[PDB]
Design an enzyme around this catalytic site. Structure first.
Site, short mmCIF file in Angstrom:
data_model
loop_
_atom_site.label_atom_id
_atom_site.label_comp_id
_atom_site.label_asym_id
_atom_site.label_seq_id
_atom_site.Cartn_x
_atom_site.Cartn_y
_atom_site.Cartn_z
N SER B 156 22.13 31.60 31.23
CA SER B 156 22.35 33.03 31.06
C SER B 156 21.09 33.90 31.08
CB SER B 156 23.16 33.30 29.79
OG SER B 156 22.55 32.71 28.66
N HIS B 184 29.87 31.13 31.88
CA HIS B 184 29.29 32.06 32.85
C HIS B 184 29.65 31.73 34.30
CE1 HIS B 184 26.96 34.49 30.09
NE2 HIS B 184 26.60 33.39 29.46
N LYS B 215 33.93 36.20 28.49
CA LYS B 215 33.35 36.56 29.78
C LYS B 215 34.33 36.87 30.91
CE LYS B 215 29.65 34.51 27.66
NZ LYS B 215 29.70 35.62 26.67
#
Lengths: 363, 369
Positions: B156, B184, B215
């Site tokens: 990230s 992610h 997310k």
């Protein structure tokens, strides 16, 4: 698949369809019926429409997640305190907070790391004094107490225990989950009904019972009670709740400050059922109607199991309790009243308990 | 009140009003823009109308909340596994699960996620992105005890890719169990959008895949998925899921709908990458130091060497009508300051052009370019 209750279609807070039968609900903890409150739903829907399904953290220099600020303010108003911390889950509040506040001693009811556990005899003011008086005086102590005992539905003698704790300078935490919105002048809980406003350090609780959503909370008037937010050894891992959840919770909490009719209905229902079942010759957990829980005591596991079955078939859902939860040889059918139960429904419930009880041999 | 971002009015997943300014959002992790997906909202609204603001627990033999059964099935379909356990919060999944699965060794990247970077588990940290340090450190451990290697699909911080294929193989050299965080990557990596592990053909070789609904999914909560036969016992783990709550009707409904949609959101997936690549290439062609030479993920991180300079450019960008992430050590190597852009599948090509214009304008003014 023991006593697995799956509710396929839910008409209201007091009735749903279980195993293809229209069934009255009397074994959930939705005390004030808030889960279906029109304003609550609306708030939830609006929040969904305006803010979407989720947000991000937005921490703001202290363990206040920006989306909790509003719901935390509702708790401040509700309890009349300066401190209020919302948790993602009930347990992160229920016992999460205890391990956070406590080598140190935690003193708790027998039937209630880094903390020495001390268990005193159930409901025994005196054993509390005895056990407390045997502890080292120097270290920090926390006494955990509940307003309502969820097992039999009786009341802790807080006024007495709280005073016995302050005899020893110990800090007092009170769980007021089973009392929220219907005990004391402002519905703050058993502690309030016993005139202990300002004498109780921390009040823990959950959104599951009266509020009607996921999550929990602590409230305090302790000046330093903001530091708690930043406890990273006893974690401040916690999630920010989504827009609809906080919207609903806030609305519900704010409404719980004014729900006088619901409060009067809850107690009528509670007293009507308690008195009614008693007058049929059932052994109840309490002589007087002390709370919204009415527990019918049976002495035989098989008998208890069958009556439950009969009651369910007859169109009523109540809670089954047994050891381990209860003392061995103690089997409970536990009714939990709802402010949304009509007087007619309570009469039907009484009729059903009579019918079932007779058939099984309890009366 | 550092870089506190409060969004008063939210028009869409890519724009809101911050400090009285119409601002493009480019610092949140709403990758697929699901939070405002019309079907998702609808699902949430119906669940609210039909089932209320909440329901009771309905936990069973195997700690399984009935209310999670449907969302847990969506994860089974999505990941093509037999095991799926939903958690109330992201962290109860993020690191909660690690302490659950491990007098045992936990081997993790030295810069492991800002969630990861207590108890019953001996912690072993290997050099960032170093396949070889992983082998070296693993080979120095007692052979007999139980080991778990935790890896992320996407880092990230800079937005680069872990060499999982290599590391996974190095772990299995030692019989260690492998956990991969695919938060992610969810919905836009591999044939089925299952994550970096899939894009590297590791389906079936990974023991556990952790993730969060924050997310891509677009709601509270997290999850683990597995094909381990005994991966139902976890539900009953002494502490870490006998403190889990059942999520309310609207949360579950939204998550399910969102997860099922993420199986088919081909247009969103193609838009996300275009946006990502357009931005990455664009910023690079202006002479910015990016975290990665090639566009590897939806995170585009601009590297600056001065805290003050970084702070000022963020300020400039915000004033100009753009919100991005600020990263600083403790989260980054000292002297590394990042402006982190996180692309959304709902960003229009026009918005990306405006972003580029803004980054140019700001970067010039501050002295970064």
């Amino acid at each position: 698949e023991p006593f697995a209750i799956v509710m396929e279609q839910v008409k209201s807070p007091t009735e749903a369809v279980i195993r293809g039968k229209d069934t009255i609900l009397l074994g959930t903890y939705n005390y004030m019926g808030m889960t279906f409150d029109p304003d609550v739903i609306a708030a939830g829907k609006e929040a969904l429409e305006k803010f979407g399904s989720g947000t991000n953290g937005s921490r703001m220099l202290n363990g206040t997640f920006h989306d909790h600020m509003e719901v935390e303010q509702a708790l401040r108003d509700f309890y009349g305190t300066t401190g209020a911390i919302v948790f993602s889950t009930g347990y992160m509040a229920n016992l999460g907070i205890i391990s956070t506040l406590a080598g140190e001693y935690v003193i708790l009811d027998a039937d209630s790391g880094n903390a020495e556990i001390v268990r005193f005899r159930h409901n025994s003011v005196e054993d509390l004094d005895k056990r407390l008086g045997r502890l080292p005086k120097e270290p920090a102590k926390l006494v955990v107490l509940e307003g309502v005992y969820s097992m039999l539905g009786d009341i802790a003698p807080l006024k007495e225990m709280v005073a016995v704790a302050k005899k020893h300078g110990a800090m007092v935490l009170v769980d007021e989950a089973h009392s929220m919105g219907f005990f004391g002048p402002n519905g703050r809980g058993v502690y309030e009904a016993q005139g202990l406003e300002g004498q109780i350090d921390f009040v823990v609780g959950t959104f599951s019972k009266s509020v009607g959503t996921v999550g929990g909370f602590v409230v305090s008037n302790h000046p330093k009670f903001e530091a708690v937010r930043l406890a990273c050894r006893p974690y401040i891992f916690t999630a920010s709740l989504p827009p609809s959840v906080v919207a609903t919770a806030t609305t519900s909490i704010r409404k719980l400050m004014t729900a006088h009719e619901k409060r009067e209905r809850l107690w009528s229902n509670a007293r009507a059922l308690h008195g009614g079942l008693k007058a049929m010759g059932f052994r109840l957990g309490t002589e007087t109607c002390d709370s919204a829980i009415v527990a019918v005591m049976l002495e035989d596991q098989e008998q208890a199991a069958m009556m439950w079955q009969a009651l369910l078939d007859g169109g009523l859902y109540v809670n089954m309790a047994r050891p381990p939860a209860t003392p061995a040889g103690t089997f409970l059918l536990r009714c939990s009243i709802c402010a949304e139960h009509t007087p007619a429904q309570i009469q039907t419930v009484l009729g059903m308990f009579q019918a079932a009880g007779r058939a099984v041999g309890v009366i």
